């Protein structure tokens, strides 16, 4: 539960938005890169594992599953690197709806930002603070604190 | 308590490492930039506040306190932008000792990374996972979860 994350990569403005979703809470972290490579994915996971207690990551495609650089970052950070096959079919739909929602929010903020990366961070902020009533930012803290105790 | 962070800026390798410290726990987030500007500081705080519930930020110097762009980001994210004057004199020493310890760790990992920014995220990871006995990553989750309940 508490330590499982899923990677997700979506496209906007000719650039790539790489997202990590904490599966149990729906909390996300994201970045904009020019294209998805093993090196960028590896650095993103190293950032994520220094901030939250990442036990497993379901990678977003077979290229990042195979990547030696992603394997090296996952070894360094103590992450079990797993596939991200939707064994639960409802998963494809949940990720897709999340990408649609994030793009809708980016569009709503995009004119308040010079750079796409700012708009994506504004969307991350709105997504994690939205109350559904607890927000995803509350749920992920709740879940991890319960695990620690 | 739970929502107070302090900014800190240190130099290495001709680049700048910008750090946000959650004061109550000692947990940190950091990034490498070519130089500290209001625009970079503002984007860093937007990232921080999408990830943790940031109520107040003690800025690291008067230029980032005055910056219109830092004020805009703090307004956008609902952060109270405050000075970072060490009213408690022990604060100068605590930040200084942190920068010294982070640079020590960066030197210990630096040959495992091509880019400095990877070494700084390795240092962030080691700093936040070290047990003092709870780690700073444990303490910030505990503190925030206690606030939520």
């Amino acid at each position: 539960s508490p330590g499982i994350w899923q990677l997700d990569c979506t496209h906007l403005e000719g650039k790539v938005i790489l997202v990590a979703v904490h599966v149990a809470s729906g909390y996300i972290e994201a970045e904009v890169i020019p294209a998805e490579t093993g090196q960028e994915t590896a650095y993103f996971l190293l950032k994520l594992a220094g901030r939250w207690p990442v036990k497993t990551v379901h990678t977003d495609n077979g290229s990042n599953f195979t990547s030696t650089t992603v394997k090296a970052a996952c070894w360094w950070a103590g992450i079990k690197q797993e596939d991200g096959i939707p064994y639960n079919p409802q998963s494809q739909g949940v990720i897709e709806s999340m990408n649609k929602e994030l793009k809708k929010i980016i569009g709503q903020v995009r004119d308040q930002a010079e750079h796409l990366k700012t708009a994506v961070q504004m969307a991350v902020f709105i997504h994690n603070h939205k109350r559904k009533g607890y927000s995803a930012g509350e749920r992920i803290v709740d879940i991890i604190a319960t695990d620690i105790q | 308590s739970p929502g107070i962070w302090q900014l800190d800026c240190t130099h290495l390798e001709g680049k700048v490492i910008l750090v946000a410290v959650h004061v109550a726990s000692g947990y940190i987030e950091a990034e490498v930039i070519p130089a500290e500007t209001g625009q970079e500081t503002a984007y860093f705080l937007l990232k921080l506040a999408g990830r943790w519930p940031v109520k107040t930020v003690h800025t690291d110097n008067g230029s980032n306190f005055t910056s219109t762009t830092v004020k805009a980001a703090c307004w956008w994210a609902g952060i109270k932008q405050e000075d970072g004057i060490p009213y408690n004199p022990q604060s100068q020493g605590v930040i200084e000792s942190m920068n010294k310890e982070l640079k020590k760790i960066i030197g210990q990992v630096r040959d495992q990374a091509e880019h400095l920014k990877t070494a700084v995220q390795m240092a962030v990871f080691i700093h936040n996972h070290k047990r003092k006995g709870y780690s700073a990553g444990e303490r910030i989750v505990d503190i925030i979860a206690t606030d939520i309940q």
Binding site: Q39, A42, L46, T69 | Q112, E114, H115, T118, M122
Partner: peptide, 8 residues
């Protein structure tokens, strides 16, 4: 480059 961030 046999680095964690670039294993080439």
């Amino acid at each position: 480059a046999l680095k964690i961030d670039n294993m080439d």
